Amino acid sequence: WFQRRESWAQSRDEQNLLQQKRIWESPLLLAAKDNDVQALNKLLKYEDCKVHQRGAMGETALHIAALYDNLEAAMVLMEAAPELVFEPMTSELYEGQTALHIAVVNQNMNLVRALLARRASVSARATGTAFRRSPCNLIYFGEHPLSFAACVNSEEIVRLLIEHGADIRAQDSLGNTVLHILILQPNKTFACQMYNLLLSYDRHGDHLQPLDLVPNHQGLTPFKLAGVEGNTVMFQHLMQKRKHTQWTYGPLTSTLYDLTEIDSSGDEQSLLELIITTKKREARQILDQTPVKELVSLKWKRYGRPYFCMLGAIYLLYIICFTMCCIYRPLKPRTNNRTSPRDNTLLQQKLLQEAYMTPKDDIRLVGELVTVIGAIIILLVEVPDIFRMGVTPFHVLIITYAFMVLVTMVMRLISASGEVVPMSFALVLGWCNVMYFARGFQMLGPFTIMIQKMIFGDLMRFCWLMAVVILGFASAFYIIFQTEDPEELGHFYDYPMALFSTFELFLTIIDGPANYNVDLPFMYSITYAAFAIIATLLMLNLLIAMMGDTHWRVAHERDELWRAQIVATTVMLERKLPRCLWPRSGICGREYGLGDRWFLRVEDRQD
Ligand X SMILES: CCCCCCCC/C=C\CCCCCCCC(=O)OC[C@H](COP(=O)(O)OCC[N+](C)(C)C)OC(=O)CCCCCCC/C=C\CCCCCCCC
Ligand Y SMILES: CC(C)CCC[C@@H](C)[C@H]1CC[C@H]2[C@@H]3CC=C4C[C@@H](OC(=O)CCC(=O)O)CC[C@]4(C)[C@H]3CC[C@]12C
Ligand Z SMILES: Cc1cccc([C@H]2CC[C@@H](N3CCN(c4cccnc4)CC3)CC2)c1
* Subset of residues 497 to 516 that bind ligand X, contact rule: CB under 6 A: 499
Distance in Å, CB of 257 to ligand X, minimum: 23
User: Distance between CA 29 and CA 153 in Å, rounded?
Assistant: 30
Is residue 440 within 8 Å of 312, Cβ to Cβ? yes
- Nearest residue (CB) to ligand X, 249 versus 464: 464
The strand pairing partners of 603, in sequence order, are 254
User: Distance between CA 592 and CA 307 in Å, rounded?
Assistant: 30
User: Distance between CA 122 and CA 142 in Å, rounded?
Assistant: 13
* Subset of residues 483 to 542 that bind ligand Y, contact rule: CB under 6 A: 496-497, 499-500, 503, 519-520, 522, 525-526, 529, 533
Of 9-17, 236-244, 275-283, 509-517: span binding Ca ion (CB under 5 A):
509-517
522 binds, among ligand Z, ligand Y, ligand X, none (CB under 5 to 8 A by kind): ligand Y
Measured from each CB, the residue nearest to ligand X is 367
* Binding residue for ligand Z, selected from 434, 534, 537, 577, defined by CB under 6 A: 534
* Binding residue for ligand X, selected from 387, 578, 592, 607, defined by CB under 6 A: 578
Instruction: State the pairing for strand pair 252-257/245-249.
Output: antiparallel
Question: Residues at the annotated binding site?
Answer: 511
DSSP 583: P
Neighbours of 469 (CB within 10 A): 17
- Nearest residue (CB) to ligand Z, 325 versus 480: 480
Distance in Å, CB of 167 to ligand Y, minimum: 44
* Binding residue for ligand X, selected from 33, 224, 364, 491, defined by CB under 6 A: 364
User: Distance between CA 394 and CA 402 in Å, rounded?
Assistant: 12
- Taken in order 213, 218, 222, 223, the sign of the CA dihedral is positive
User: Distance between CA 467 and CA 473 in Å, rounded?
Assistant: 10
User: Distance between CA 259 and CA 596 in Å, rounded?
Assistant: 11
Of 144-152, 378-386, 445-453, 485-493: span binding ligand Z (CB under 6 A):
445-453
* Binding residue for ligand Z, selected from 232, 277, 285, 452, defined by CB under 6 A: 452
* Subset of residues 365 to 384 that bind ligand X, contact rule: CB under 6 A: 366-367, 370, 381
- Nearest residue (CB) to Ca ion, 25 versus 511: 511
Using the CB atoms, write b or e for 33-60: b if 16+ within 10 Å: bebbeeebeebbeeeeeebeebbbbbbb
Instruction: Check residue 425 for interaction with ligand Y (CB under 6 A).
Output: no
Instruction: Check residue 376 for interaction with ligand Z (CB under 6 A).
Output: no
Distance in Å, CB of 534 to ligand Z, minimum: 6
* Binding residue for ligand Z, selected from 201, 425, 462, 493, defined by CB under 6 A: 425
Give Cβ neighbours of residue 256 (< 8 Å, ≥ 6 apart).
243, 244, 245, 246, 599, 600, 601
Longest dimension (CA), the chain: 112
Nearest in space to 270 (alpha carbons), one of 259, 281, 262: 262
Residues in the interface with ligand X (CB under 6 A) total 46
User: Distance between CA 60 and CA 88 in Å, rounded?
Assistant: 8
Burial of 426 (0-12, 13-18, 19+ CB in 10 A): buried
Nearest in space to 156 (alpha carbons), one of 107, 98, 105: 107
User: Distance between CA 350 and CA 415 in Å, rounded?
Assistant: 11
Of 283-291, 422-430, 493-501, 583-591: span binding ligand X (CB under 6 A):
493-501
Question: Residues at the annotated binding site for Ca(2+)?
Answer: 511
Instruction: Check residue 432 for interaction with ligand Z (CB under 6 A).
Output: yes
Give Cβ neighbours of residue 355 (< 8 Å, ≥ 6 apart).
330, 332, 361
- Nearest residue (CB) to Ca ion, 511 versus 607: 511
User: Distance between CA 228 and CA 222 in Å, rounded?
Assistant: 10
Neighbours of 3 (CB within 10 A): 6
Instruction: Check residue 591 for interaction with Ca ion (CB under 5 A).
Output: no
- Helices vs strands, H then E, count in the chain: 31, 4
* Binding residue for ligand Y, selected from 139, 160, 427, 467, defined by CB under 6 A: 467
Instruction: Check residue 328 for interaction with ligand X (CB under 6 A).
Output: yes
- Nearest residue (CB) to Ca ion, 206 versus 511: 511
Distance in Å, CB of 277 to ligand Y, minimum: 11
Instruction: Check residue 467 for interaction with ligand X (CB under 6 A).
Output: yes
Distance in Å, CB of 511 to Ca ion, minimum: 4
* Binding residue for ligand Z, selected from 81, 168, 451, 467, defined by CB under 6 A: 451
Is residue 260 within 8 Å of 223, Cβ to Cβ? no
Q: What does the binding site for Ca ion look like in residue numbers (CB under 5 A)? A: 511
Q: What does the binding site for ligand Y look like in residue numbers (CB under 6 A)? A: 311, 314-315, 318, 370, 373-374, 377-378, 381-382, 394-395, 398, 436, 463, 466-467, 470, 496-497, 499-500, 503, 519-520, 522, 525-526, 529, 533
Q: What does the binding site for ligand X look like in residue numbers (CB under 6 A)? A: 305-307, 309-314, 316-318, 320-321, 323-325, 327-328, 360, 363-364, 366-367, 370, 381, 434-435, 437-438, 463-465, 467-468, 471, 494-496, 499, 572-573, 576, 578, 580-581
Q: What does the binding site for ligand Z look like in residue numbers (CB under 6 A)? A: 393, 424-425, 428, 432, 435, 448, 451-452, 455, 526-527, 530, 534
